[PDB]
Amino acid sequence: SMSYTWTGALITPCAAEESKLPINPLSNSLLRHHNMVYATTSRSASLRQKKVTFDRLQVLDDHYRDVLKEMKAKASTVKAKLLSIEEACKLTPPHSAKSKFGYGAKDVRNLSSRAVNHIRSVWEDLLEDTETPIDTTIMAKSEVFCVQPEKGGRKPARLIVFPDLGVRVCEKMALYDVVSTLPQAVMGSSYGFQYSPKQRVEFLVNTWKSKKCPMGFSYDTRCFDSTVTESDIRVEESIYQCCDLAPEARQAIRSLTERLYIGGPLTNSKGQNCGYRRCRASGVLTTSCGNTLTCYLKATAACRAAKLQDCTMLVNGDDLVVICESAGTQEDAAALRAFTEAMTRYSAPPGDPPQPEYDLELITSCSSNVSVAHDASGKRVYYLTRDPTTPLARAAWETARHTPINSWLGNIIMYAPTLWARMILMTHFFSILLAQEQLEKALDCQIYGACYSIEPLDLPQIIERLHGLSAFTLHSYSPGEINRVASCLRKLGVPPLRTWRHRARSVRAKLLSQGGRAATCGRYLFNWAVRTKLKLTPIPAASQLDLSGWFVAGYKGGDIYHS
Ligand SMILES: [Mg+2]
Numbered sequence: 135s136m137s138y139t140w141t142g143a144l145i146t147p148c149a150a151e152e153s154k155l156p157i158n159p160l161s162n163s164l165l166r167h168h169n170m171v172y173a174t175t176s177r178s179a180s181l182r183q184k185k186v187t188f189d190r191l192q193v194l195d196d197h198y199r200d201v202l203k204e205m206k207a208k209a210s211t212v213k214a215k216l217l218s219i220e221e222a223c224k225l226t227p228p229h230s231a232k233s234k235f236g237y238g239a240k241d242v243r244n245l246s247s248r249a250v251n252h253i254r255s256v257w258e259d260l261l262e263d264t265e266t267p268i269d270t271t272i273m274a275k276s277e278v279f280c281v282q283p284e285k286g287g288r289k290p291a292r293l294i295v296f297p298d299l300g301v302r303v304c305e306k307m308a309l310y311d312v313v314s315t316l317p318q319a320v321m322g323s324s325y326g327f328q329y330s331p332k333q334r335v336e337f338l339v340n341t342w343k344s345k346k347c348p349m350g351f352s353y354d355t356r357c358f359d360s361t362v363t364e365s366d367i368r369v370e371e372s373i374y375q376c377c378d379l380a381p382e383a384r385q386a387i388r389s390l391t392e393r394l395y396i397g398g399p400l401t402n403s404k405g406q407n408c409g410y411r412r413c414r415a416s417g418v419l420t421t422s423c424g425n426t427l428t429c430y431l432k433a434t435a436a437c438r439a440a441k442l443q444d445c446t447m448l449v450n451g452d453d454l455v456v457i458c459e460s461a462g463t464q465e466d467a468a469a470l471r472a473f474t475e476a477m478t479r480y481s482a483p484p485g486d487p488p489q490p491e492y493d494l495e496l497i498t499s500c501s502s503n504v505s506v507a508h509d510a511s512g513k514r515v516y517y518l519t520r521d522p523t524t525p526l527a528r529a530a531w532e533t534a535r536h537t538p539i540n541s542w543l544g545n546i547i548m549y550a551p552t553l554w555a556r557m558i559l560m561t562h563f564f565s566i567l568l569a570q571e572q573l574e575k576a577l578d579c580q581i582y583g584a585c586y587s588i589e590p591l592d593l594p595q596i597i598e599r600l601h602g603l604s605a606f607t608l609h610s611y612s613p614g615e616i617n618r619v620a621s622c623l624r625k626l627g628v629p630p631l632r633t634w635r636h637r638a639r640s641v642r643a644k645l646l647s648q649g650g651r652a653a654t655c656g657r658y659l660f661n662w663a664v665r666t667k668l669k670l671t672p673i674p675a676a677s678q679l680d681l682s683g684w685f686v687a688g689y690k691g692g693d694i695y696h697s
Pocket residue numbers: 354355356357358452485
């Protein structure tokens with residue numbers, strides 16, 4: 135069937151859309167080539183619509199059915215709980231999109247009578263009506279990027295599709311426990327969202343070293359959400375139904391599957407009918423779990439079709455990396471083509487054709503790659519890094535324009551050991567918080583799709599527990615990483631590293647001048663900036679903070695707020 139059908143009504147914005155950095159940047163200090171930065175808007179919606187609209191032809195074989203049965207047997211060990219209205223309400227982010235029924239996220243979190251009474255009626259309606267498609271809103275997503283190195287090369291807006299707030303709270307009641315527990319039960323160590331960055335690199339490095347002769351590849355499915363078929367979504371449900379479930383949870387899942395997950399009408403921000411979806415909606419609770427299960431099922435079956443040997447996969451939503459035993463350069467390239475042909479039959483054709491890779495450091499998955507540096511004792515440390523271009527572009531945007539979600543904080547947390555996060559991101563934002571005395575103020579950021587409210591003065595503890603003490607002492611970065619960063623700073627017009635070393639000293643000195651958590655930030659976060667390096671010992675606070683559910687599951691698109 136067609137992934138989408140369109141009526142002609144436009145994807146419209148809800149308010150003014152900004153597409154460029156403000157006229158005189160609030161921090162030309164970070165980035166000088168302001169014209170390189172842009173944000174996507176609804177103006178490019180039709181370009182995205184063209185890419186994402188096509189007929190899916192899916193052919194399932196015995197390998198697919200075999201793997202599905204294996205997955206179901208593991209799912210059948212799961213017992214899932216229904217969430218109470220109160221528990222589900224508390225998972226709603228404070229700035230979640232308001233309901234058309236006259237209440238908003240604040241009312242949901244406060245358990246207001248209007249909100250709670252509507253949510254209860256939405257729940258009963260899932261039991262009373264098993265078929266009527268549930269309405270969804272379609273919008274163009276606002277995301278900031280740096281322009282392609284081809285003069286005028288811009289990505290079009292992604293299209294987000296989500297149901298009303300009342301429905302989203304009902305999804306949590308029925309499915310939050312399922313999507314939080316089932317993927318690991320089914321996929322075991324292949325489930326990527328159970329790992330912190332440090333644990334992910336460890337799993338990757340250990341997997342690499344376990345092969346007599348390792349070969350690895352990432353597989354990029356073209357527009358994964360659009361490739362998800364009605365069959366795939368019902369197969370996903372068939373896995374959920376293997377859980378022990380409350381009767382109303384079973385029904386809610388059955389109704390949500392047929393009324394929302396498999397497809398439905400698309401309404402624009404003006405309330406006009408835009409058309410019809412028959413693929414994955416980006417903005418429902420099951421999107422991350424569903425994509426991960428579907429990708430894992432198709433890829434695992436595809437490895438079997440391709441006769442890849444000793445495959446170990448790591449799956450994060452639509453992101454896939456596999457490491458296996460090599461059969462020779464020639465036989466690998468052939469196997470990889472067979473794998474791609476199998477994935478294509480399963481309705482997951484590639485964007486960029488995959489390439490066998492015989493150096494772990496050259497594989498990028500989840501936009502990231504493994505690289506190597508050295509700690510104080512000169513011991514080899516592996517860490518995850520990425521090209522810093524998008525993080526820096528978004529940092530510049532967030533410095534110049536007010537933003538609800540602070541991607542720079544998420545990046546500092548997730549990439550704390552990197553050369554660019556330590557020298558640029560940390561230096562830049564700590565100077566800003568220092569100047570405005572906003573240091574103590576908690577900020578919103580996302581980790582694996584879930585929203586968290588985090589105090590920047592807690593970064594030392596967070597980083598140590600997540601990445602290890604070596605995150606504060608890494609030196610001797612790889613030539614490839616140094617050159618990638620240098621090239622990035624050239625392109626964006628970011629001042630040279632040596633310069634950041636200077637600003638850092640000033641910041642470090644000011645932080646120490648304050649004492650307390652501020653002083654701890656000075657000592658640990660900026661020890662790279664001095665030669666007379668303060669000896670760094672494990673912080674007392676590291677081990678005694680609530681980092682429980684930070685790396686349990688993926689929640690991208692699921693409207694989840696943690697703590
Ligand atoms: Mg893809």
